[PDB]
Amino acid sequence: CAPRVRAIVTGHTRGLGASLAEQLLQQDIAVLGVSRSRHPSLAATAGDRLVETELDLSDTAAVAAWLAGGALRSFVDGASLVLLFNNAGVVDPIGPLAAQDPALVARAVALNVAAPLMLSAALVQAAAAPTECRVLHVSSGAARNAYAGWSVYCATKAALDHHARAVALDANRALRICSVAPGVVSTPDEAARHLIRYALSDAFGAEPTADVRNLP
Amino acid sequence: PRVRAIVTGHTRGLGASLAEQLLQQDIAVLGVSRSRHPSLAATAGDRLVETELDLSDTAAVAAWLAGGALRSFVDGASLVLLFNNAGVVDPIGPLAAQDPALVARAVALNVAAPLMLSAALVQAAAAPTECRVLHVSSGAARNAYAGWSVYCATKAALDHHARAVALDALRICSVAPGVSTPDEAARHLIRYALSDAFGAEPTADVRNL
């Protein structure tokens, strides 16, 4: 007699993820919490309606292996509606390029981009008809506005926004997606010729984005 | 030489054209790809250095950047160009069709590697060396296309990375080549997620519906 509406919340042990998991369970929506640790106390309040998975979502090999296993399919089996809250994320490494550890950059991209995109695909593939899926990427104002020191975070949340825009154009069975800011935190030779000319030009860098077809 | 360039994915396509033409205008090239270019090193002499590195293996990339190869290549240069060209378009298709393992590989190659190399280049170049980072982007970074959600996401990340880096001896551009409290926030997000309007817009902000 499991709840028919169910939700997956990544990073459910603190912050927004904890508030999401707590309120979903209050409203009789089952929650699969996916985090490196467990929620301090929600299990004692919510009982077996909370399922907690210990997973490092920044380890994409571990994520793929967990997704190749049956835990997600077991959780969504028989549901009418499954919500995925892609909430887990990190803002580190903060600072300009000169301050960023490449290993921390990789970890942020894996957690903030690879895991939401992998979990979105896996949920749709685990949910058999007639289950409906709703994917909510937790985005940021930083996905749409650039901020000094936050180039890594900005990059990762911009990815989630554009993922949603493109998924929305696909022919999906029963899928809704949205990337939501929460308020808290030519030949190759021809193309190469143009890119090199632009890269060497005095004007290079005047604007942060460009398209070679606009270049005189 | 005084001007040097790093080209990822230099063994074919646009990357090969970049490497060949840079060599033609007296610029030293470090090619970084899983294998070597099929013929370039024969004609290039000491002006081409080729690193065999799987740019989708972020552990291997971090370890390579932890060594002295990049610092040794840019040592003494007056200008270093980084062409973040390597990328994959797979997996193509809707969410129901995408192998999560291939999703991970695309994000690692298309996003992690350019961002890691960009940071490492700035750190490896001592003054007064100038650095120029060019992310190879796409119209798909700015326009959405059915079937291309993974590629779209990855190139949009490169655009916004460049916008933020620009706000921080460095020039950067992402160039398409032509080919409240937590409890309150949670309350608003859950209501929105359950609402009939959910998904009508692909992006939203809790501050405005």
Pick out its properties.
homodimer; 216 residues; alpha/beta; six-stranded parallel beta sheet; 7 helices; 7 strands; Short-chain dehydrogenase/reductase SDR (chain B); cytoplasm (chain B); sepiapterin reductase (NADP+) activity (chain B); oxidoreductase (chain B); SDR_fam (chain B)
Concise description?
Chain A: One of its GO terms (biological process) is tetrahydrobiopterin biosynthetic process. Chain A is of the alpha/beta class.
What's the gyration radius of chain A in Å?
20 Å
Supply the number of structural domains of chain A.
1
End-to-end CA span of chain A: 66 Å
Shape of chain A: elongated
* CATH topology name of chain A: Rossmann fold
- Estimate percent helicity of chain A: 40-55%
**Beta-strand content estimate of chain A:** 15-25%
Lateral strand order in the biggest sheet of chain A: 3-2-1-4-5-6
List the helices and strands of chain A in order.
EHEHEHHEHEHEHE
Largest sheet of chain A: 6 strands, parallel
Oligomeric status of the shown chains?
Answer: homodimer
- Second-tier CATH architecture of chain A: 3-Layer(aba) Sandwich
In total, how many beta strands of chain A? 7
Structural class of chain A: alpha/beta
* CATH homologous superfamily designation of chain A: NAD(P)-binding Rossmann-like Domain
Q: Could you name the CATH class of chain A?
A: Alpha Beta
Number of helices of chain A: 7
GO biological process, one term (chain B): tetrahydrobiopterin biosynthetic process
Protein name (chain B): Short-chain dehydrogenase/reductase SDR
InterPro entries (chain B): Biopterin_syn/organic_redct (IPR051721), NAD(P)-bd_dom_sf (IPR036291), SDR_fam (IPR002347)
Organism (chain B): Burkholderia vietnamiensis (strain G4 / LMG 22486) (Burkholderia cepacia (strain R1808))
